[PDB]
Amino acid sequence: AVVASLKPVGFIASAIADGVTETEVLLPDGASEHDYSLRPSDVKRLQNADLVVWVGPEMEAFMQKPVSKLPGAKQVTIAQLEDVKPLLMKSDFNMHLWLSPEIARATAVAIHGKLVELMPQSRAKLDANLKDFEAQLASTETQVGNELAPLKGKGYFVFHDAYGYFEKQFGLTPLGHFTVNPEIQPGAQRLHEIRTQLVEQKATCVFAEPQFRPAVVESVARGTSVRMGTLDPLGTNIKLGKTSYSEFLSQLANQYASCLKG
Numbered sequence: 295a296v297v298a299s300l301k302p303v304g305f306i307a308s309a310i311a312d313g314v315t316e317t318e319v320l321l322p323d324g325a326s327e328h329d330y331s332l333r334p335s336d337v338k339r340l341q342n343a344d345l346v347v348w349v350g351p352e353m354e355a356f357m358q359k360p361v362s363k364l365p366g367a368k369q370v371t372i373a374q375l376e377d378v379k380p381l382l383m384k385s386d387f388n389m390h391l392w393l394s395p396e397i398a399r400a401t402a403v404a405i406h407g408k409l410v411e412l413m414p415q416s417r418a419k420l421d422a423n424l425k426d427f428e429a430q431l432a433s434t435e436t437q438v439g440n441e442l443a444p445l446k447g448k449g450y451f452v453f454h455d456a457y458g459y460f461e462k463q464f465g466l467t468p469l470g471h472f473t474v475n476p477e478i479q480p481g482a483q484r485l486h487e488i489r490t491q492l493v494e495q496k497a498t499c500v501f502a503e504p505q506f507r508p509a510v511v512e513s514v515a516r517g518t519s520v521r522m523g524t525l526d527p528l529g530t531n532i533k534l535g536k537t538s539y540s541e542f543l544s545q546l547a548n549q550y551a552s553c554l555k556g
């Protein structure tokens with residue numbers, strides 16, 4: 295199998311590996327990229343992988359050691375790809391790379407190249423999968439761009455700073471985030487200051503995330519006219535599959551729009 299660290303990385307892998315080999319995801323549904331320790335069975339899946347795909351040591355540090363044990367031919371370290379380095383955006387760089395369509399393309403290309411070498415019998419299928427992935431992703435970018443266009447200029451806060459690549463591509467205008475690392479409590483001072491900004495800068499939304507209890511986000515919204523939504527940067531409800539990555543970007547767009555639209 296192809297073993298991906300995070301579900302949306304699994305979505306990209308599953309576009310390319312469809313009808314070639316299975317895709318497995320290490321980080322379980324409901325867990326955060328910022329808070330994991332590999333279970334004994336996760337370590338086994340990784341050791342037995344045909345190919346491992348992950349962002350890199352500045353993101354999923356919990357897996358740097360076992361990944362380093364694998365042959366180079368059996369890993370894709372997205373953040374270290376020559377195609378990806380020029381696309382990295384400064385936060386020290388933002389490592390939430392799976393929300394960048396262009397980085398997703400570079401990732402798909404790298405997965406394709408690795409699997410063509412490992413599984414030469416599947417060359418035609420891999421080629422067709424990559425072609426299909428790119429066609430679908432282009433369609434999705436057009437659709438998501440259109441959906442988000444009327445929402446540009448509307449202010450909002452996100453729970454943690456995960457969305458920068460996606461927001462930059464589609465022209466969304468967040469005012470800020472409650473947290474950088476969602477494992478760190480923002481503190482009461484920060485919270486009343488966020489409310490002040492939401493009110494003074496006439497923000498539309500605040501967003502919770504399914505991986506974290508929303509009480510803190512709800513507490514800031516209270517007293518104000520700000521609407522509450524939810525963004526899921528890990529696409530928890532979406533199943534792996536050929537069109538899963540496009541489904542994920544479309545779902546994220548819908549989550550923004552559900553709250554931000556008037």
Ligand SMILES: [Zn+2]
Binds near residue numbers: 454
């Ligand atoms: Zn994150």
